[PDB]
């Protein structure tokens with residue numbers, strides 16, 4: 246019996262528009278580490294099953310992640326919150342991306358797409374991203390002050406996707422426009438955006454890219470040629486839509502919130518500026534936990550840590566709670582860029598769906614923080630961050646920063 250308000254719902258977007266429910270997750274870890282989060286009829290974020298099991302401990306997140314025959318991604322998809330009135334068919338179309346597939350379909354697609362994320366493929370992007378990171382941080386610093394989210398955090402993740410896919414320089418503006426429309430839409434600031442339209446345009450663009458690349462040594466060629474497996478044009482289209490969501494706002498929020506952590510822990514920022522430890526990226530992702538939660542649905546009864554999960558019930562893995570698990574991390578509430586080992590689940594629990602982009606993301610994070618250290622070492626915030634209204638993505642919309650640190654306060 247945890248101490249929470251009547252009807253509290255850990256996927257309620259109205260919570261995340263204002264704060265992370267840190268105290269409430271700590272309460273569950275302590276008192277009810279697997280807890281039934283009931284949901285009133287019509288208040289289930291698109292699911293009409295009465296609620297879900299909140300999973301708060303790291304070991305439980307890993308156990309659910311491993312057992313993908315029991316804990317399905319396909320059955321209800323992995324996003325645990327949409328608009329309450331969403332039609333079921335709009336939840337089910339998510340099954341066209343590999344993140345919402347189970348074996349065998351997932352297994353085939355994962356094996357093919359892994360070609361795009363080899364050490365060689367990712368390292369080939371390094372120098373361009375480093376150069377781009379340097380210019381992003383210089384141009385921002387020269388502006389004196391501005392919105393850190395737009396002027397520092399947004400562009401590099403987009404350029405990492407563009408560089409991975411070999412998107413022509415002239416096509417990057419339109420690619421980025423579509424991609425920025427494809428996630429974060431539950432907030433009134435973005436209420437007028439139609440993600441479905443952008444997703445359709447991206448698919449059309451990507452399918453042509455496949456068409457034409459059949460007509461080189463690059464990731465797109467490798468994906469659409471027999472290894473004997475290959476993506477069809479449409480499988481490529483859905484792979485690109487998946488990246489446009491999986492790898493954009495996530496990395497962006499890691500950058501914003503990693504900078505917010507440095508502002509809050511100036512001794513760590515001083516240490517970072519001197520040492521530039523590559524371990525910083527993992528601590529940044531643990532602290533930022535850009536995906537608050539993903540869900541699964543049990544396909545059979547399963548006893549998890551002494552709790553009887555029943556066939557059909559959803560389990561929601563709160564990576565935001567697991568990443569602060571007092572039994573796993575030493576003093577998880579302090580930000581330590583040298584933390585090592587750092588067994589966080591910000592990229593998922595180990596398992597079939599573990600973030601395929603994780604090394605690309607760490608590289609993007611490390612390059613942008615190097616550039617920030619280089620060009621704006623004295624930065625200070627001007628005002629509090631503005632959070633995103635979403636029941637599953639932990640987002641910062643805007644954050645006004647004085648890059649020079651010279652302004653008062």
Ligand code: HEM
Nearest residue numbers: 343344491492495496499591592593598599600601602606
């Ligand atoms: C800090 C930034 C990022 C975070 C926090 C993040 C987090 C995650 C998480 C939690 C999952 C699901 C893991 C699971 O269910 O076990 C995932 C899957 C995925 N991520 Fe990332 N990710 C990030 C960056 C990226 C980037 C940069 C890319 C590619 C450009 C990417 C591509 C993908 C893909 C394609 C999947 C689906 C893999 C599958 O279902 O087999 N991610 N990510």
